[PDB]
Amino acid sequence: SHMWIGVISLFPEMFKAITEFGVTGRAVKHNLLKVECWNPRDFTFDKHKTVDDRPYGGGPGMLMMVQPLRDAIHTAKAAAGEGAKVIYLSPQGRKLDQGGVTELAQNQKLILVCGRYEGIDERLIQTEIDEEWSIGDYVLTGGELPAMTLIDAVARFIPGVLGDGLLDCPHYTRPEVLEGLTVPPVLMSGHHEEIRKWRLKQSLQRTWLRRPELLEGLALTDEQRKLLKEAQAEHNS
Amino acid sequence: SHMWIGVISLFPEMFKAITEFGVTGRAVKHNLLKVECWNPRDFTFDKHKTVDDRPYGGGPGMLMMVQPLRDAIHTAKAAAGEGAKVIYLSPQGRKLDQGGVTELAQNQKLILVCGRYEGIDERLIQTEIDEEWSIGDYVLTGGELPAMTLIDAVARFIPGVLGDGLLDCPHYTRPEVLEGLTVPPVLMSGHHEEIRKWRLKQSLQRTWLRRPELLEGLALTDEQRKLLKEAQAEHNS
Ligand SMILES: NC(=O)c1cnc(NC2CCCC2)nc1N
Ligand SMILES: NC(=O)c1cnc(NC2CCCC2)nc1N
Protein backbone atom coordinates (compact mmCIF):
# COMPACT_ATOMS: atom_id res chain seq x y z
CA SER A 1 0.00 0.00 0.00
CA HIS A 2 1.91 2.98 -1.30
CA MET A 3 1.34 6.68 -0.84
CA TRP A 4 1.02 9.53 -3.34
CA ILE A 5 1.77 13.05 -2.21
CA GLY A 6 1.04 16.06 -4.40
CA VAL A 7 3.02 19.17 -3.46
CA ILE A 8 2.28 22.76 -4.35
CA SER A 9 5.51 24.83 -4.02
CA LEU A 10 7.41 27.75 -5.55
CA PHE A 11 10.59 25.72 -4.90
CA PRO A 12 9.93 22.14 -5.98
CA GLU A 13 13.69 21.41 -6.17
CA MET A 14 13.85 21.58 -2.35
CA PHE A 15 12.03 18.28 -2.30
CA LYS A 16 15.11 16.52 -3.75
CA ALA A 17 16.26 16.53 -0.14
CA ILE A 18 13.78 13.78 0.56
CA THR A 19 13.27 12.22 -2.88
CA GLU A 20 16.98 11.67 -3.68
CA PHE A 21 18.51 10.64 -0.34
CA GLY A 22 18.35 8.07 2.41
CA VAL A 23 15.35 5.97 3.41
CA THR A 24 12.88 8.30 1.76
CA GLY A 25 14.97 8.44 -1.44
CA ARG A 26 14.87 4.69 -1.58
CA ALA A 27 11.09 4.70 -0.97
CA VAL A 28 10.68 6.99 -3.99
CA LYS A 29 13.03 5.00 -6.26
CA HIS A 30 11.19 1.79 -5.36
CA ASN A 31 7.75 3.41 -6.04
CA LEU A 32 6.59 3.00 -2.45
CA LEU A 33 6.25 6.78 -2.17
CA LYS A 34 5.45 9.09 -5.02
CA VAL A 35 6.01 12.81 -4.70
CA GLU A 36 4.69 15.03 -7.46
CA CYS A 37 5.19 18.85 -7.46
CA TRP A 38 3.29 21.73 -9.13
CA ASN A 39 4.86 25.22 -9.10
CA PRO A 40 2.44 28.24 -9.09
CA ARG A 41 5.06 29.99 -11.22
CA ASP A 42 4.17 27.68 -14.09
CA PHE A 43 0.50 28.88 -13.88
CA THR A 44 1.28 32.60 -14.23
CA PHE A 45 0.51 34.48 -17.45
CA ASP A 46 2.28 37.82 -17.07
CA LYS A 47 5.73 38.39 -18.54
CA HIS A 48 7.50 38.42 -15.14
CA LYS A 49 5.74 35.31 -13.88
CA THR A 50 4.47 37.07 -10.78
CA VAL A 51 3.58 34.82 -7.88
CA ASP A 52 3.07 37.32 -5.03
CA ASP A 53 0.51 40.09 -4.45
CA ARG A 54 -0.20 42.93 -1.99
CA PRO A 55 -2.33 42.27 1.07
CA TYR A 56 -5.56 44.18 1.43
CA GLY A 57 -5.26 46.48 4.40
CA GLY A 58 -1.53 47.00 3.96
CA GLY A 59 1.28 45.41 5.88
CA PRO A 60 4.97 44.68 5.73
CA GLY A 61 5.00 41.78 3.33
CA MET A 62 3.35 40.13 0.39
CA LEU A 63 1.04 37.16 0.08
CA MET A 64 1.02 34.44 -2.50
CA MET A 65 -0.92 35.59 -5.55
CA VAL A 66 -4.31 33.84 -5.63
CA GLN A 67 -4.75 32.88 -9.32
CA PRO A 68 -1.47 30.98 -9.95
CA LEU A 69 -1.74 29.20 -6.59
CA ARG A 70 -5.41 28.35 -7.04
CA ASP A 71 -4.77 27.00 -10.56
CA ALA A 72 -1.85 24.90 -9.30
CA ILE A 73 -4.00 23.44 -6.55
CA HIS A 74 -6.80 22.62 -9.01
CA THR A 75 -4.31 20.86 -11.27
CA ALA A 76 -2.93 18.77 -8.41
CA LYS A 77 -6.50 17.85 -7.36
CA ALA A 78 -7.28 16.77 -10.92
CA ALA A 79 -4.12 14.65 -11.01
CA ALA A 80 -4.97 13.09 -7.62
CA GLY A 81 -8.45 12.02 -8.53
CA GLU A 82 -10.92 11.19 -5.77
CA GLY A 83 -10.16 10.91 -2.06
CA ALA A 84 -7.07 13.16 -1.70
CA LYS A 85 -6.93 15.17 1.52
CA VAL A 86 -5.67 18.71 0.86
CA ILE A 87 -3.47 20.14 3.63
CA TYR A 88 -2.09 23.62 4.17
CA LEU A 89 0.91 23.85 6.48
CA SER A 90 1.14 26.79 8.85
CA PRO A 91 1.68 27.72 12.53
CA GLN A 92 -2.14 28.18 12.67
CA GLY A 93 -2.73 24.48 12.04
CA ARG A 94 -3.18 21.46 14.29
CA LYS A 95 0.16 20.81 15.95
CA LEU A 96 1.77 17.63 14.55
CA ASP A 97 2.71 14.76 16.91
CA GLN A 98 3.19 11.06 16.36
CA GLY A 99 -0.50 10.32 16.88
CA GLY A 100 -1.20 12.94 14.23
CA VAL A 101 1.34 11.34 11.90
CA THR A 102 -0.27 7.92 12.29
CA GLU A 103 -3.64 9.52 11.40
CA LEU A 104 -2.23 11.24 8.30
CA ALA A 105 -0.46 8.05 7.25
CA GLN A 106 -3.88 6.39 6.81
CA ASN A 107 -4.44 8.45 3.60
CA GLN A 108 -3.38 6.98 0.27
CA LYS A 109 -3.19 10.48 -1.26
CA LEU A 110 -2.32 13.86 0.23
CA ILE A 111 -1.88 17.23 -1.41
CA LEU A 112 0.41 19.56 0.57
CA VAL A 113 0.24 23.27 -0.03
CA CYS A 114 3.43 25.16 0.88
CA GLY A 115 3.03 28.80 1.86
CA ARG A 116 5.66 31.48 1.07
CA TYR A 117 5.94 35.24 1.78
CA GLU A 118 3.45 36.11 4.52
CA GLY A 119 1.08 33.28 3.63
CA ILE A 120 -2.02 32.71 1.49
CA ASP A 121 -5.47 34.25 1.09
CA GLU A 122 -7.82 33.10 3.86
CA ARG A 123 -10.57 32.31 1.34
CA LEU A 124 -8.33 29.72 -0.35
CA ILE A 125 -8.10 27.99 3.02
CA GLN A 126 -11.86 28.13 3.24
CA THR A 127 -12.47 26.90 -0.33
CA GLU A 128 -9.56 24.57 -1.13
CA ILE A 129 -8.08 23.22 2.10
CA ASP A 130 -9.40 20.24 4.00
CA GLU A 131 -7.05 20.48 6.98
CA GLU A 132 -4.43 22.84 8.41
CA TRP A 133 -1.36 21.34 10.22
CA SER A 134 1.68 22.82 11.98
CA ILE A 135 4.96 20.96 12.54
CA GLY A 136 5.46 23.02 15.72
CA ASP A 137 5.13 26.43 17.42
CA TYR A 138 7.81 28.31 15.46
CA VAL A 139 7.99 30.46 12.33
CA LEU A 140 9.80 29.59 9.14
CA THR A 141 10.35 31.25 5.77
CA GLY A 142 8.23 28.65 3.98
CA GLY A 143 6.04 25.57 4.28
CA GLU A 144 8.38 23.33 2.29
CA LEU A 145 10.44 22.10 5.25
CA PRO A 146 7.18 21.42 7.15
CA ALA A 147 5.83 19.51 4.11
CA MET A 148 9.02 17.45 3.86
CA THR A 149 8.95 16.78 7.56
CA LEU A 150 5.39 15.51 7.31
CA ILE A 151 6.26 13.38 4.25
CA ASP A 152 9.27 11.78 5.98
CA ALA A 153 7.21 11.05 9.15
CA VAL A 154 4.35 9.37 7.28
CA ALA A 155 6.66 7.53 4.85
CA ARG A 156 7.91 5.55 7.85
CA PHE A 157 4.49 3.92 7.95
CA ILE A 158 4.51 2.67 4.36
CA PRO A 159 5.21 -1.05 4.26
CA GLY A 160 8.63 -1.72 2.75
CA VAL A 161 10.11 1.63 3.62
CA LEU A 162 11.75 0.69 6.94
CA GLY A 163 13.91 -2.37 7.52
CA ASP A 164 4.69 3.90 22.36
CA GLY A 165 4.53 7.32 23.94
CA LEU A 166 7.88 7.30 25.72
CA LEU A 167 11.26 8.88 24.87
CA ASP A 168 13.85 6.52 23.34
CA CYS A 169 16.35 4.59 25.50
CA PRO A 170 20.13 5.36 25.31
CA HIS A 171 21.94 3.43 22.61
CA TYR A 172 25.51 2.10 22.61
CA THR A 173 27.85 0.70 19.98
CA ARG A 174 31.63 0.09 19.71
CA PRO A 175 33.94 0.71 21.44
CA GLU A 176 33.32 -0.85 24.79
CA VAL A 177 35.05 2.14 26.44
CA LEU A 178 34.82 5.68 25.11
CA GLU A 179 36.62 8.55 26.82
CA GLY A 180 36.48 6.43 29.99
CA LEU A 181 32.74 5.76 29.75
CA THR A 182 31.85 2.09 29.61
CA VAL A 183 28.86 0.38 28.03
CA PRO A 184 26.30 -0.71 30.71
CA PRO A 185 27.20 -4.38 31.47
CA VAL A 186 23.58 -5.54 31.08
CA LEU A 187 23.88 -4.81 27.34
CA MET A 188 26.91 -7.10 27.15
CA SER A 189 25.14 -9.87 29.09
CA GLY A 190 23.20 -11.43 26.21
CA HIS A 191 20.24 -11.67 28.60
CA HIS A 192 17.46 -10.59 26.23
CA GLU A 193 14.76 -10.16 28.84
CA GLU A 194 17.01 -8.19 31.22
CA ILE A 195 18.03 -6.01 28.23
CA ARG A 196 14.42 -5.36 27.25
CA LYS A 197 13.53 -4.34 30.82
CA TRP A 198 16.61 -2.12 31.23
CA ARG A 199 15.74 -0.31 27.97
CA LEU A 200 12.14 0.14 29.01
CA LYS A 201 13.14 1.38 32.44
CA GLN A 202 15.57 3.86 30.84
CA SER A 203 12.81 5.19 28.53
CA LEU A 204 10.47 5.58 31.53
CA GLN A 205 13.20 7.35 33.53
CA ARG A 206 14.16 9.72 30.70
CA THR A 207 10.48 10.53 29.93
CA TRP A 208 9.86 11.27 33.63
CA LEU A 209 12.97 13.47 34.00
CA ARG A 210 12.70 15.33 30.69
CA ARG A 211 9.05 15.26 29.65
CA PRO A 212 6.94 14.37 32.65
CA GLU A 213 3.80 15.73 30.98
CA LEU A 214 4.05 12.93 28.40
CA LEU A 215 3.61 10.32 31.16
CA GLU A 216 0.29 11.85 32.21
CA GLY A 217 -1.19 10.84 28.85
CA LEU A 218 -0.33 7.18 29.24
CA ALA A 219 -1.98 4.20 30.90
CA LEU A 220 1.15 2.44 32.10
CA THR A 221 1.28 -1.36 32.16
CA ASP A 222 1.91 -3.03 35.55
CA GLU A 223 5.46 -3.63 34.34
CA GLN A 224 5.96 -0.01 33.33
CA ARG A 225 4.55 1.24 36.68
CA LYS A 226 7.00 -1.07 38.48
CA LEU A 227 10.06 -0.01 36.41
CA LEU A 228 9.13 3.66 36.71
CA LYS A 229 8.79 3.31 40.51
CA GLU A 230 12.24 1.68 40.55
CA ALA A 231 13.80 4.45 38.41
CA GLN A 232 12.24 7.12 40.65
CA ALA A 233 13.54 5.40 43.83
CA GLU A 234 17.04 5.06 42.38
CA HIS A 235 16.90 8.71 41.37
CA ASN A 236 15.99 9.62 44.95
CA SER A 237 18.82 7.23 46.00
CA SER B 1 25.98 40.12 12.73
CA HIS B 2 26.01 36.95 10.69
CA MET B 3 25.70 33.34 11.73
CA TRP B 4 27.89 30.30 11.01
CA ILE B 5 26.36 26.86 11.23
CA GLY B 6 28.46 23.71 11.04
CA VAL B 7 26.51 20.60 10.06
CA ILE B 8 27.47 16.99 10.56
CA SER B 9 25.47 14.79 8.12
CA LEU B 10 25.70 11.67 5.96
CA PHE B 11 23.65 13.58 3.37
CA PRO B 12 25.09 17.08 3.09
CA GLU B 13 23.41 17.61 -0.32
CA MET B 14 20.03 17.76 1.45
CA PHE B 15 21.06 21.14 2.76
CA LYS B 16 20.86 22.61 -0.77
CA ALA B 17 17.16 22.85 0.01
CA ILE B 18 17.93 25.78 2.27
CA THR B 19 21.23 27.06 0.88
CA GLU B 20 20.11 27.35 -2.77
CA PHE B 21 16.50 28.59 -2.54
CA GLY B 22 14.33 31.39 -1.26
CA VAL B 23 15.07 33.71 1.65
CA THR B 24 17.62 31.37 3.17
CA GLY B 25 19.33 30.85 -0.21
CA ARG B 26 19.69 34.58 -0.51
CA ALA B 27 21.05 34.81 3.05
CA VAL B 28 23.76 32.29 2.12
CA LYS B 29 24.64 33.96 -1.21
CA HIS B 30 24.94 37.33 0.56
CA ASN B 31 27.16 35.83 3.33
CA LEU B 32 24.66 36.60 6.07
CA LEU B 33 24.41 32.88 6.83
CA LYS B 34 27.15 30.37 6.32
CA VAL B 35 26.41 26.68 6.31
CA GLU B 36 29.35 24.30 6.28
CA CYS B 37 28.90 20.47 6.18
CA TRP B 38 31.15 17.55 7.24
CA ASN B 39 30.16 14.00 6.20
CA PRO B 40 31.22 11.12 8.56
CA ARG B 41 31.66 9.06 5.39
CA ASP B 42 34.71 11.15 4.54
CA PHE B 43 36.30 10.16 7.92
CA THR B 44 36.03 6.39 7.39
CA PHE B 45 39.10 4.29 6.63
CA ASP B 46 37.72 0.91 5.57
CA LYS B 47 37.24 0.04 1.92
CA HIS B 48 33.42 0.21 2.07
CA LYS B 49 33.36 3.51 3.94
CA THR B 50 31.23 2.08 6.73
CA VAL B 51 29.27 4.62 8.74
CA ASP B 52 26.94 2.40 10.80
CA ASP B 53 27.57 -0.18 13.54
CA ARG B 54 25.66 -2.75 15.62
CA PRO B 55 24.11 -1.73 18.91
CA TYR B 56 25.31 -3.43 22.05
CA GLY B 57 22.48 -5.49 23.46
CA GLY B 58 20.97 -6.23 20.06
CA GLY B 59 17.99 -4.61 18.44
CA PRO B 60 16.31 -4.09 15.11
CA GLY B 61 18.51 -1.41 13.65
CA MET B 62 21.97 0.06 13.48
CA LEU B 63 23.54 3.10 15.06
CA MET B 64 25.91 5.59 13.58
CA MET B 65 29.47 4.28 13.85
CA VAL B 66 31.31 6.18 16.59
CA GLN B 67 34.77 6.84 15.07
CA PRO B 68 33.78 8.52 11.75
CA LEU B 69 31.10 10.59 13.49
CA ARG B 70 33.36 11.58 16.37
CA ASP B 71 36.15 12.59 13.96
CA ALA B 72 33.71 14.64 11.87
CA ILE B 73 32.47 16.44 14.97
CA HIS B 74 36.04 17.18 16.10
CA THR B 75 36.84 18.61 12.69
CA ALA B 76 33.78 20.87 12.73
CA LYS B 77 34.71 22.05 16.25
CA ALA B 78 38.23 22.86 15.07
CA ALA B 79 36.83 24.81 12.11
CA ALA B 80 34.40 26.69 14.38
CA GLY B 81 36.98 27.85 16.86
CA GLU B 82 35.86 29.04 20.29
CA GLY B 83 32.29 29.60 21.44
CA ALA B 84 30.32 27.24 19.14
CA LYS B 85 27.37 25.51 20.78
CA VAL B 86 27.14 21.86 19.67
CA ILE B 87 23.57 20.57 19.26
CA TYR B 88 22.24 17.09 18.63
CA LEU B 89 18.74 16.91 17.20
CA SER B 90 16.42 14.17 18.43
CA PRO B 91 12.92 13.54 19.86
CA GLN B 92 14.68 13.28 23.26
CA GLY B 93 15.71 16.94 23.15
CA ARG B 94 14.14 20.16 24.39
CA LYS B 95 11.07 20.78 22.27
CA LEU B 96 11.64 23.75 19.91
CA ASP B 97 9.26 26.76 20.01
CA GLN B 98 9.69 30.37 19.01
CA GLY B 99 11.12 31.34 22.39
CA GLY B 100 13.63 28.54 21.91
CA VAL B 101 14.45 29.80 18.43
CA THR B 102 15.09 33.32 19.71
CA GLU B 103 17.46 31.82 22.33
CA LEU B 104 19.35 29.77 19.73
CA ALA B 105 19.54 32.76 17.40
CA GLN B 106 21.71 34.55 20.00
CA ASN B 107 24.66 32.25 19.08
CA GLN B 108 27.09 33.37 16.39
CA LYS B 109 28.14 29.75 15.77
CA LEU B 110 26.25 26.47 16.04
CA ILE B 111 27.28 22.95 15.14
CA LEU B 112 24.30 20.69 14.34
CA VAL B 113 24.73 16.95 14.51
CA CYS B 114 22.25 15.00 12.36
CA GLY B 115 21.42 11.48 13.51
CA ARG B 116 20.66 8.61 11.07
CA TYR B 117 19.71 4.91 11.50
CA GLU B 118 18.55 4.42 15.09
CA GLY B 119 20.64 7.27 16.46
CA ILE B 120 24.07 7.81 18.03
CA ASP B 121 26.06 6.41 20.95
CA GLU B 122 24.89 7.91 24.26
CA ARG B 123 28.49 8.61 25.31
CA LEU B 124 28.96 10.93 22.32
CA ILE B 125 26.01 12.94 23.64
CA GLN B 126 27.70 13.01 27.01
CA THR B 127 31.15 13.95 25.67
CA GLU B 128 30.50 16.06 22.56
CA ILE B 129 27.04 17.61 22.75
CA ASP B 130 26.20 20.80 24.58
CA GLU B 131 22.44 20.70 24.04
CA GLU B 132 19.78 18.34 22.69
CA TRP B 133 16.76 19.84 20.79
CA SER B 134 13.64 18.36 19.16
CA ILE B 135 11.61 20.10 16.44
CA GLY B 136 8.51 18.31 17.75
CA ASP B 137 7.03 15.07 19.18
CA TYR B 138 7.29 12.89 16.05
CA VAL B 139 9.81 10.48 14.54
CA LEU B 140 11.71 10.98 11.32
CA THR B 141 14.26 9.01 9.31
CA GLY B 142 17.00 11.55 10.04
CA GLY B 143 17.99 14.75 11.83
CA GLU B 144 18.66 16.69 8.62
CA LEU B 145 15.12 18.07 8.20
CA PRO B 146 15.14 19.07 11.89
CA ALA B 147 18.54 20.77 11.40
CA MET B 148 17.27 22.65 8.34
CA THR B 149 14.13 23.63 10.17
CA LEU B 150 16.19 25.06 13.01
CA ILE B 151 18.51 26.87 10.56
CA ASP B 152 15.59 28.46 8.68
CA ALA B 153 13.91 29.56 11.97
CA VAL B 154 17.05 31.21 13.37
CA ALA B 155 18.08 32.71 10.01
CA ARG B 156 14.96 34.89 10.24
CA PHE B 157 16.67 36.68 13.11
CA ILE B 158 19.83 37.61 11.21
CA PRO B 159 19.75 41.28 10.24
CA GLY B 160 19.38 41.64 6.47
CA VAL B 161 17.72 38.31 5.91
CA LEU B 162 14.08 39.45 6.06
CA GLY B 163 12.65 42.43 4.21
CA ASP B 164 4.10 37.94 20.06
CA GLY B 165 2.65 34.68 21.27
CA LEU B 166 -0.57 34.68 19.25
CA LEU B 167 -1.60 32.87 16.04
CA ASP B 168 -1.45 34.95 12.84
CA CYS B 169 -4.47 36.94 11.58
CA PRO B 170 -6.23 35.97 8.28
CA HIS B 171 -4.70 37.57 5.22
CA TYR B 172 -6.42 38.71 2.01
CA THR B 173 -5.24 39.76 -1.42
CA ARG B 174 -6.86 40.16 -4.89
CA PRO B 175 -9.55 39.57 -5.98
CA GLU B 176 -12.06 41.44 -3.92
CA VAL B 177 -14.50 38.53 -4.33
CA LEU B 178 -13.41 34.90 -4.50
CA GLU B 179 -15.93 32.10 -4.96
CA GLY B 180 -18.49 34.49 -3.45
CA LEU B 181 -16.38 35.32 -0.39
CA THR B 182 -15.64 39.01 -0.01
CA VAL B 183 -12.69 40.72 1.65
CA PRO B 184 -13.68 42.17 5.09
CA PRO B 185 -14.60 45.84 4.38
CA VAL B 186 -12.40 47.14 7.21
CA LEU B 187 -9.35 46.08 5.17
CA MET B 188 -10.58 48.19 2.25
CA SER B 189 -11.23 51.20 4.51
CA GLY B 190 -7.70 52.60 4.63
CA HIS B 191 -8.28 53.19 8.35
CA HIS B 192 -4.90 52.05 9.67
CA GLU B 193 -5.83 51.99 13.34
CA GLU B 194 -9.11 50.12 12.73
CA ILE B 195 -7.14 47.64 10.57
CA ARG B 196 -4.52 47.09 13.27
CA LYS B 197 -7.22 46.42 15.88
CA TRP B 198 -9.21 44.09 13.61
CA ARG B 199 -6.06 42.06 12.91
CA LEU B 200 -5.18 41.88 16.58
CA LYS B 201 -8.71 40.89 17.51
CA GLN B 202 -8.67 38.17 14.83
CA SER B 203 -5.35 36.79 16.20
CA LEU B 204 -6.79 36.77 19.74
CA GLN B 205 -9.98 35.04 18.52
CA ARG B 206 -8.13 32.39 16.49
CA THR B 207 -5.66 31.71 19.37
CA TRP B 208 -8.59 31.31 21.79
CA LEU B 209 -10.58 29.01 19.48
CA ARG B 210 -7.67 26.88 18.23
CA ARG B 211 -4.94 27.04 20.87
CA PRO B 212 -6.44 28.29 24.10
CA GLU B 213 -3.50 26.95 26.11
CA LEU B 214 -1.25 29.50 24.38
CA LEU B 215 -3.29 32.36 25.90
CA GLU B 216 -2.62 31.09 29.42
CA GLY B 217 1.08 31.89 28.95
CA LEU B 218 0.49 35.52 28.08
CA ALA B 219 0.03 38.71 30.07
CA LEU B 220 -2.48 40.40 27.81
CA THR B 221 -2.41 44.19 27.40
CA ASP B 222 -5.57 46.11 28.39
CA GLU B 223 -6.27 46.42 24.66
CA GLN B 224 -5.83 42.71 24.05
CA ARG B 225 -8.08 41.83 27.02
CA LYS B 226 -10.75 44.15 25.60
CA LEU B 227 -10.54 42.77 22.02
CA LEU B 228 -10.51 39.19 23.29
CA LYS B 229 -13.61 39.88 25.44
CA GLU B 230 -15.29 41.34 22.32
CA ALA B 231 -14.36 38.32 20.16
CA GLN B 232 -15.65 35.93 22.84
CA ALA B 233 -18.96 37.85 23.14
CA GLU B 234 -19.44 37.89 19.37
CA HIS B 235 -18.68 34.18 19.31
CA ASN B 236 -21.37 33.63 21.94
CA SER B 237 -23.56 35.96 19.81
N1 LIG C 1 5.57 25.62 12.15
C1 LIG C 1 5.12 25.42 10.78
O1 LIG C 1 4.53 24.39 10.46
C2 LIG C 1 5.34 26.55 9.76
C3 LIG C 1 6.09 27.66 10.15
N2 LIG C 1 6.28 28.68 9.29
C4 LIG C 1 5.67 28.58 8.05
N3 LIG C 1 5.86 29.66 7.15
C5 LIG C 1 5.12 29.73 5.91
C6 LIG C 1 3.65 29.85 6.16
C7 LIG C 1 3.28 31.28 5.85
C8 LIG C 1 4.42 31.84 5.02
C9 LIG C 1 5.60 30.97 5.24
N4 LIG C 1 4.97 27.51 7.63
C10 LIG C 1 4.76 26.47 8.43
N5 LIG C 1 3.97 25.35 7.97
N1 LIG D 1 11.41 15.40 16.13
C1 LIG D 1 12.83 15.50 15.82
O1 LIG D 1 13.46 16.53 16.08
C2 LIG D 1 13.55 14.28 15.22
C3 LIG D 1 12.78 13.17 14.86
N2 LIG D 1 13.38 12.07 14.35
C4 LIG D 1 14.76 12.09 14.27
N3 LIG D 1 15.39 10.93 13.75
C5 LIG D 1 16.83 10.79 13.78
C6 LIG D 1 17.34 10.77 15.18
C7 LIG D 1 17.72 9.34 15.47
C8 LIG D 1 17.84 8.65 14.13
C9 LIG D 1 17.10 9.49 13.14
N4 LIG D 1 15.53 13.16 14.57
C10 LIG D 1 14.99 14.27 15.06
N5 LIG D 1 15.84 15.39 15.42
UniProtKB/Swiss-Prot annotation, chains A, B:
<dbReference type="GO" id="GO:0052906">
    <property type="term" value="F:tRNA (guanine(37)-N1)-methyltransferase activity"/>
</dbReference>
<dbReference type="InterPro" id="IPR023148">
    <property type="entry name" value="tRNA_m1G_MeTrfase_C_sf"/>
</dbReference>
<comment type="similarity">
    <text>Belongs to the RNA methyltransferase TrmD family.</text>
</comment>
<keyword id="KW-0963">Cytoplasm</keyword>
<keyword id="KW-0489">Methyltransferase</keyword>
<dbReference type="GO" id="GO:0005829">
    <property type="term" value="C:cytosol"/>
</dbReference>
<keyword id="KW-0949">S-adenosyl-L-methionine</keyword>
<keyword id="KW-0819">tRNA processing</keyword>
<feature type="binding site">
    <location>
        <begin position="135"/>
        <end position="140"/>
    </location>
    <ligand>
        <name>S-adenosyl-L-methionine</name>
    </ligand>
</feature>
<keyword id="KW-0808">Transferase</keyword>
<dbReference type="InterPro" id="IPR016009">
    <property type="entry name" value="tRNA_MeTrfase_TRMD/TRM10"/>
</dbReference>
<dbReference type="InterPro" id="IPR029028">
    <property type="entry name" value="Alpha/beta_knot_MTases"/>
</dbReference>
<feature type="binding site">
    <location>
        <position position="115"/>
    </location>
    <ligand>
        <name>S-adenosyl-L-methionine</name>
    </ligand>
</feature>
<comment type="function">
    <text>Specifically methylates guanosine-37 in various tRNAs.</text>
</comment>
<dbReference type="InterPro" id="IPR029026">
    <property type="entry name" value="tRNA_m1G_MTases_N"/>
</dbReference>
<comment type="subunit">
    <text>Homodimer.</text>
</comment>
<dbReference type="InterPro" id="IPR002649">
    <property type="entry name" value="tRNA_m1G_MeTrfase_TrmD"/>
</dbReference>
<dbReference type="GO" id="GO:0002939">
    <property type="term" value="P:tRNA N1-guanine methylation"/>
</dbReference>
<feature type="binding site">
    <location>
        <position position="88"/>
    </location>
    <ligand>
        <name>S-adenosyl-L-methionine</name>
    </ligand>
</feature>
<dbReference type="Pfam" id="PF01746">
    <property type="entry name" value="tRNA_m1G_MT"/>
</dbReference>
<protein>
    <recommendedName>
        <fullName>tRNA (guanine-N(1)-)-methyltransferase</fullName>
        <ecNumber>2.1.1.228</ecNumber>
    </recommendedName>
</protein>
